Amino acid sequence: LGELVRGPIPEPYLKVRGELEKHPVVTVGDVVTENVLKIGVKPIIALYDLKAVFLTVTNPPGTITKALLDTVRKAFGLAERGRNVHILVSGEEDLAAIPAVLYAPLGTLVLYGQPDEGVVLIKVTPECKRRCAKIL
Ligand SMILES: Nc1nc2c(ncn2[C@@H]2O[C@H](COP(=O)(O)OP(=O)(O)OP(=O)(O)O)[C@@H](O)[C@H]2O)c(=O)[nH]1
Ligand SMILES: [Mg+2]
């Protein structure tokens, strides 16, 4: 929904680093997560596929189960309390950016990967929270 930042890995992470350091960050994807960690930023929540507190969840590709939605809500609960949470998904977390935006505090940056293209960065605001609810 937000802004795509283009470039070969890891140049987009380097471009946005200053912004990532000044806000809480949620990462969706193994490549996104790893790349944010390696520039010294610790996500409050990181969701990635199986191949800090750990939560496990199964989510069949191209769905948003009730279980994923609960795990994400729980994650944000734990993050409110200053835990970093890694959600390890068995299945696929292809849609997980939507709930991330729903349940997130305002001013949170959510990142996910645009295959081959770059990194999508989303500033969490009442508008984009509104539409993400609509998307579901
Ligand atoms: N050009 C470019 N593409 C990127 C960049 N970061 C991520 N992407 C793309 O986004 C894709 C998806 O990222 P992830 O979802 O983290 O990767 P994944 O292997 O699907 O990880 P899982 O979702 O855990 O299975 C990657 O395969 C890349 O092609 C970047 O900095 N530049
Ligand atoms: Mg992915």
mmCIF file with all atom_site columns, all heavy atoms in Angstrom, residues 73-84:
data_model
loop_
_atom_site.group_PDB
_atom_site.id
_atom_site.type_symbol
_atom_site.label_atom_id
_atom_site.label_alt_id
_atom_site.label_comp_id
_atom_site.label_asym_id
_atom_site.label_entity_id
_atom_site.label_seq_id
_atom_site.pdbx_PDB_ins_code
_atom_site.Cartn_x
_atom_site.Cartn_y
_atom_site.Cartn_z
_atom_site.occupancy
_atom_site.B_iso_or_equiv
_atom_site.pdbx_formal_charge
_atom_site.auth_seq_id
_atom_site.auth_comp_id
_atom_site.auth_asym_id
_atom_site.auth_atom_id
_atom_site.pdbx_PDB_model_num
ATOM 1  N N   . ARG A 1 73 ? -2.022 -10.445 16.755 1.00 0.00 ? 73 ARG A N   1
ATOM 2  C CA  . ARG A 1 73 ? -2.547 -9.643  17.849 1.00 0.00 ? 73 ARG A CA  1
ATOM 3  C C   . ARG A 1 73 ? -1.770 -9.941  19.129 1.00 0.00 ? 73 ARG A C   1
ATOM 4  O O   . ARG A 1 73 ? -1.429 -9.025  19.870 1.00 0.00 ? 73 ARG A O   1
ATOM 5  C CB  . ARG A 1 73 ? -4.038 -9.907  18.075 1.00 0.00 ? 73 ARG A CB  1
ATOM 6  C CG  . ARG A 1 73 ? -4.625 -9.135  19.250 1.00 0.00 ? 73 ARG A CG  1
ATOM 7  C CD  . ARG A 1 73 ? -5.910 -9.744  19.777 1.00 0.00 ? 73 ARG A CD  1
ATOM 8  N NE  . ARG A 1 73 ? -7.061 -9.360  18.973 1.00 0.00 ? 73 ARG A NE  1
ATOM 9  C CZ  . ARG A 1 73 ? -7.705 -10.164 18.133 1.00 0.00 ? 73 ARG A CZ  1
ATOM 10 N NH1 . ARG A 1 73 ? -7.358 -11.435 18.027 1.00 0.00 ? 73 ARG A NH1 1
ATOM 11 N NH2 . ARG A 1 73 ? -8.702 -9.692  17.403 1.00 0.00 ? 73 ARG A NH2 1
ATOM 12 N N   . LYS A 1 74 ? -1.517 -11.225 19.405 1.00 0.00 ? 74 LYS A N   1
ATOM 13 C CA  . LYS A 1 74 ? -0.762 -11.589 20.595 1.00 0.00 ? 74 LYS A CA  1
ATOM 14 C C   . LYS A 1 74 ? 0.628  -10.960 20.523 1.00 0.00 ? 74 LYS A C   1
ATOM 15 O O   . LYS A 1 74 ? 1.127  -10.424 21.514 1.00 0.00 ? 74 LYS A O   1
ATOM 16 C CB  . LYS A 1 74 ? -0.664 -13.109 20.754 1.00 0.00 ? 74 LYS A CB  1
ATOM 17 C CG  . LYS A 1 74 ? 0.096  -13.565 21.993 1.00 0.00 ? 74 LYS A CG  1
ATOM 18 C CD  . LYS A 1 74 ? 0.255  -15.066 22.115 1.00 0.00 ? 74 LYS A CD  1
ATOM 19 C CE  . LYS A 1 74 ? 0.890  -15.486 23.425 1.00 0.00 ? 74 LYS A CE  1
ATOM 20 N NZ  . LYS A 1 74 ? 1.213  -16.933 23.441 1.00 0.00 ? 74 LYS A NZ  1
ATOM 21 N N   . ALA A 1 75 ? 1.228  -10.995 19.328 1.00 0.00 ? 75 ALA A N   1
ATOM 22 C CA  . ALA A 1 75 ? 2.576  -10.489 19.136 1.00 0.00 ? 75 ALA A CA  1
ATOM 23 C C   . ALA A 1 75 ? 2.643  -9.021  19.551 1.00 0.00 ? 75 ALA A C   1
ATOM 24 O O   . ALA A 1 75 ? 3.602  -8.596  20.191 1.00 0.00 ? 75 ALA A O   1
ATOM 25 C CB  . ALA A 1 75 ? 2.998  -10.677 17.699 1.00 0.00 ? 75 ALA A CB  1
ATOM 26 N N   . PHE A 1 76 ? 1.633  -8.247  19.141 1.00 0.00 ? 76 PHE A N   1
ATOM 27 C CA  . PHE A 1 76 ? 1.604  -6.816  19.398 1.00 0.00 ? 76 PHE A CA  1
ATOM 28 C C   . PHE A 1 76 ? 1.403  -6.557  20.888 1.00 0.00 ? 76 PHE A C   1
ATOM 29 O O   . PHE A 1 76 ? 1.945  -5.591  21.429 1.00 0.00 ? 76 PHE A O   1
ATOM 30 C CB  . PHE A 1 76 ? 0.519  -6.138  18.561 1.00 0.00 ? 76 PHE A CB  1
ATOM 31 C CG  . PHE A 1 76 ? 0.995  -5.685  17.207 1.00 0.00 ? 76 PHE A CG  1
ATOM 32 C CD1 . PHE A 1 76 ? 0.549  -6.310  16.052 1.00 0.00 ? 76 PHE A CD1 1
ATOM 33 C CD2 . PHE A 1 76 ? 1.969  -4.707  17.093 1.00 0.00 ? 76 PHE A CD2 1
ATOM 34 C CE1 . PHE A 1 76 ? 1.008  -5.910  14.808 1.00 0.00 ? 76 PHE A CE1 1
ATOM 35 C CE2 . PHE A 1 76 ? 2.427  -4.308  15.847 1.00 0.00 ? 76 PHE A CE2 1
ATOM 36 C CZ  . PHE A 1 76 ? 1.965  -4.928  14.709 1.00 0.00 ? 76 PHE A CZ  1
ATOM 37 N N   . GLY A 1 77 ? 0.656  -7.458  21.537 1.00 0.00 ? 77 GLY A N   1
ATOM 38 C CA  . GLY A 1 77 ? 0.540  -7.462  22.986 1.00 0.00 ? 77 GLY A CA  1
ATOM 39 C C   . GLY A 1 77 ? 1.904  -7.579  23.660 1.00 0.00 ? 77 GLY A C   1
ATOM 40 O O   . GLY A 1 77 ? 2.230  -6.799  24.553 1.00 0.00 ? 77 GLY A O   1
ATOM 41 N N   . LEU A 1 78 ? 2.717  -8.523  23.175 1.00 0.00 ? 78 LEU A N   1
ATOM 42 C CA  . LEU A 1 78 ? 4.010  -8.806  23.775 1.00 0.00 ? 78 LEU A CA  1
ATOM 43 C C   . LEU A 1 78 ? 4.973  -7.654  23.491 1.00 0.00 ? 78 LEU A C   1
ATOM 44 O O   . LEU A 1 78 ? 5.850  -7.352  24.299 1.00 0.00 ? 78 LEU A O   1
ATOM 45 C CB  . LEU A 1 78 ? 4.534  -10.130 23.212 1.00 0.00 ? 78 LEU A CB  1
ATOM 46 C CG  . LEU A 1 78 ? 3.873  -11.385 23.781 1.00 0.00 ? 78 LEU A CG  1
ATOM 47 C CD1 . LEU A 1 78 ? 4.211  -12.610 22.944 1.00 0.00 ? 78 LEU A CD1 1
ATOM 48 C CD2 . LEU A 1 78 ? 4.289  -11.604 25.229 1.00 0.00 ? 78 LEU A CD2 1
ATOM 49 N N   . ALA A 1 79 ? 4.792  -7.002  22.339 1.00 0.00 ? 79 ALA A N   1
ATOM 50 C CA  . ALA A 1 79 ? 5.680  -5.926  21.929 1.00 0.00 ? 79 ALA A CA  1
ATOM 51 C C   . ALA A 1 79 ? 5.374  -4.656  22.722 1.00 0.00 ? 79 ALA A C   1
ATOM 52 O O   . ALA A 1 79 ? 6.278  -3.883  23.022 1.00 0.00 ? 79 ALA A O   1
ATOM 53 C CB  . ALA A 1 79 ? 5.562  -5.692  20.440 1.00 0.00 ? 79 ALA A CB  1
ATOM 54 N N   . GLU A 1 80 ? 4.093  -4.438  23.048 1.00 0.00 ? 80 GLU A N   1
ATOM 55 C CA  . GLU A 1 80 ? 3.701  -3.340  23.919 1.00 0.00 ? 80 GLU A CA  1
ATOM 56 C C   . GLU A 1 80 ? 4.511  -3.405  25.216 1.00 0.00 ? 80 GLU A C   1
ATOM 57 O O   . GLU A 1 80 ? 4.794  -2.371  25.815 1.00 0.00 ? 80 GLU A O   1
ATOM 58 C CB  . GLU A 1 80 ? 2.195  -3.380  24.194 1.00 0.00 ? 80 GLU A CB  1
ATOM 59 C CG  . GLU A 1 80 ? 1.695  -2.233  25.065 1.00 0.00 ? 80 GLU A CG  1
ATOM 60 C CD  . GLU A 1 80 ? 1.820  -2.438  26.568 1.00 0.00 ? 80 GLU A CD  1
ATOM 61 O OE1 . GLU A 1 80 ? 1.972  -3.600  26.998 1.00 0.00 ? 80 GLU A OE1 1
ATOM 62 O OE2 . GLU A 1 80 ? 1.774  -1.434  27.315 1.00 0.00 ? 80 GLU A OE2 1
ATOM 63 N N   . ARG A 1 81 ? 4.924  -4.622  25.601 1.00 0.00 ? 81 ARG A N   1
ATOM 64 C CA  . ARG A 1 81 ? 5.556  -4.869  26.887 1.00 0.00 ? 81 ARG A CA  1
ATOM 65 C C   . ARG A 1 81 ? 7.073  -4.942  26.734 1.00 0.00 ? 81 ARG A C   1
ATOM 66 O O   . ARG A 1 81 ? 7.776  -5.247  27.695 1.00 0.00 ? 81 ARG A O   1
ATOM 67 C CB  . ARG A 1 81 ? 5.016  -6.162  27.508 1.00 0.00 ? 81 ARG A CB  1
ATOM 68 C CG  . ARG A 1 81 ? 3.609  -6.025  28.076 1.00 0.00 ? 81 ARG A CG  1
ATOM 69 C CD  . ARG A 1 81 ? 3.168  -7.214  28.906 1.00 0.00 ? 81 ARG A CD  1
ATOM 70 N NE  . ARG A 1 81 ? 2.505  -8.234  28.106 1.00 0.00 ? 81 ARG A NE  1
ATOM 71 C CZ  . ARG A 1 81 ? 1.310  -8.097  27.536 1.00 0.00 ? 81 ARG A CZ  1
ATOM 72 N NH1 . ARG A 1 81 ? 0.652  -6.955  27.629 1.00 0.00 ? 81 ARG A NH1 1
ATOM 73 N NH2 . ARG A 1 81 ? 0.777  -9.108  26.870 1.00 0.00 ? 81 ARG A NH2 1
ATOM 74 N N   . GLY A 1 82 ? 7.562  -4.726  25.508 1.00 0.00 ? 82 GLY A N   1
ATOM 75 C CA  . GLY A 1 82 ? 8.987  -4.551  25.272 1.00 0.00 ? 82 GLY A CA  1
ATOM 76 C C   . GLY A 1 82 ? 9.694  -5.852  24.893 1.00 0.00 ? 82 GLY A C   1
ATOM 77 O O   . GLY A 1 82 ? 10.918 -5.908  24.908 1.00 0.00 ? 82 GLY A O   1
ATOM 78 N N   . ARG A 1 83 ? 8.919  -6.882  24.534 1.00 0.00 ? 83 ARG A N   1
ATOM 79 C CA  . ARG A 1 83 ? 9.462  -8.089  23.928 1.00 0.00 ? 83 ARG A CA  1
ATOM 80 C C   . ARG A 1 83 ? 9.544  -7.906  22.414 1.00 0.00 ? 83 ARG A C   1
ATOM 81 O O   . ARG A 1 83 ? 8.647  -7.326  21.807 1.00 0.00 ? 83 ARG A O   1
ATOM 82 C CB  . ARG A 1 83 ? 8.583  -9.302  24.252 1.00 0.00 ? 83 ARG A CB  1
ATOM 83 C CG  . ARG A 1 83 ? 8.395  -9.565  25.740 1.00 0.00 ? 83 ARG A CG  1
ATOM 84 C CD  . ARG A 1 83 ? 9.538  -10.377 26.315 1.00 0.00 ? 83 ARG A CD  1
ATOM 85 N NE  . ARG A 1 83 ? 9.547  -10.376 27.771 1.00 0.00 ? 83 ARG A NE  1
ATOM 86 C CZ  . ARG A 1 83 ? 10.623 -10.609 28.517 1.00 0.00 ? 83 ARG A CZ  1
ATOM 87 N NH1 . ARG A 1 83 ? 11.777 -10.902 27.942 1.00 0.00 ? 83 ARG A NH1 1
ATOM 88 N NH2 . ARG A 1 83 ? 10.545 -10.533 29.834 1.00 0.00 ? 83 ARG A NH2 1
ATOM 89 N N   . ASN A 1 84 ? 10.649 -8.376  21.823 1.00 0.00 ? 84 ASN A N   1
ATOM 90 C CA  . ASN A 1 84 ? 10.728 -8.623  20.392 1.00 0.00 ? 84 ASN A CA  1
ATOM 91 C C   . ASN A 1 84 ? 10.141 -10.001 20.108 1.00 0.00 ? 84 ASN A C   1
ATOM 92 O O   . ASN A 1 84 ? 10.424 -10.954 20.823 1.00 0.00 ? 84 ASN A O   1
ATOM 93 C CB  . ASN A 1 84 ? 12.169 -8.557  19.874 1.00 0.00 ? 84 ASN A CB  1
ATOM 94 C CG  . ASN A 1 84 ? 12.858 -7.257  20.221 1.00 0.00 ? 84 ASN A CG  1
ATOM 95 O OD1 . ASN A 1 84 ? 12.390 -6.186  19.846 1.00 0.00 ? 84 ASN A OD1 1
ATOM 96 N ND2 . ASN A 1 84 ? 13.932 -7.335  20.990 1.00 0.00 ? 84 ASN A ND2 1
#
